[PDB]
């Protein structure tokens, strides 16, 4: 086991994180796994290379039905979010089935990080992950 520190650049998406994280079943999944109710959104970070989550120990949930529609399970990887000298509880989240790795990762946390830590696009933060 190694603790890895990785840097990423804050970027904007199309608001997808707030869609999913506001849905009751996803809220419940994250609350149970992580022990906090995430702020409804994902802080999207651009890394210098693709992130392969299958290189880490994560929890994976199954697809589920909500109000007549099938939704995808998720892979959940606990992290610490490193902003200055603060270590903030969070997680990396990826859809259960992805067909390649991405240099963009989605981070969840108990608070809105942009608001609490004044992050803007292009700001670089770090994350700590058990590998």
Ligand X SMILES: Nc1ccn([C@@H]2O[C@H](COP(=O)(O)OP(=O)(O)O)[C@@H](O)[C@H]2O)c(=O)n1
Please name the residues in contact with 87: beta carbons below 8 A apart, sequence gap of 6 or more. Answer: 80, 81, 128
Among 2, 3, 14, 68, which residue interacts with ligand X (rule: CB under 6 A)? 14
Residue 106 annotated as part of some ligand binding site = yes
- Alpha helices by DSSP H, the chain: 16-21, 24-34, 113-116
Kindly tell me which of 25 and 110 has the beta carbon lying closer to ligand X: 110
Stretch that binds ligand X, among 24-32, 51-59, 97-105, 108-116 (CB under 6 A): 108-116
Report the distance separating Cα 45 and Cα 92, nearest Å: 10
Take residue 126 and report the two structure tokens written for it: 């770090």
Contact code string over 34-73 relative to ligand X, x by CB under 6 A? -----x-xxxx-----------------------------
Sign, CA dihedral 23-61-3-37, equals positive
112 is an interface residue for ligand X by CB under 6 A:
yes
Name which of residues 34 to 53 contact Mg ion (CB under 5 A).
42, 44
Secondary structure class of 35 (helix, strand, coil): coil
Binding region for ligand X (CB under 6 A) out of 7-15, 23-31, 55-63, 71-79: 7-15
- Cβ 109 to ligand X, closest distance in Å? 4
Cα distances from 17 to residues 2, 73, 84, 92, 93, in angstroms, run 29, 14, 24, 12, 10
Binding residues for CDP: 13-18, 111-114
Binding site for ligand X (CB under 6 A): 12-18, 39, 41-44, 108-109, 112-114
């Amino acid at each position: 086991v190694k603790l890895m520190i990785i840097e990423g650049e804050v970027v904007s998406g199309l608001g997808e994180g707030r869609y999913f994280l506001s849905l009751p079943p996803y809220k419940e999944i994250f609350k149970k796994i992580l022990g906090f109710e995430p702020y409804e959104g994902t802080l999207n970070l651009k890394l210098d290379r693709e992130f392969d989550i299958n290189k880490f120990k994560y929890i994976e949930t199954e697809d589920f039905e909500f109000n007549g529609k099938r939704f995808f399970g998720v892979k959940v990887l606990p992290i610490k979010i490193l902003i200055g000298n603060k270590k903030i509880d969070g997680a990396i989240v990826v859809p259960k089935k992805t067909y390649h790795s991405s240099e963009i990762i989605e981070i969840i946390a108990p608070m809105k990080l942009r608001e609490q830590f004044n992050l803007k696009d292009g700001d670089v933060i770090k994350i700590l992950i058990k590998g």
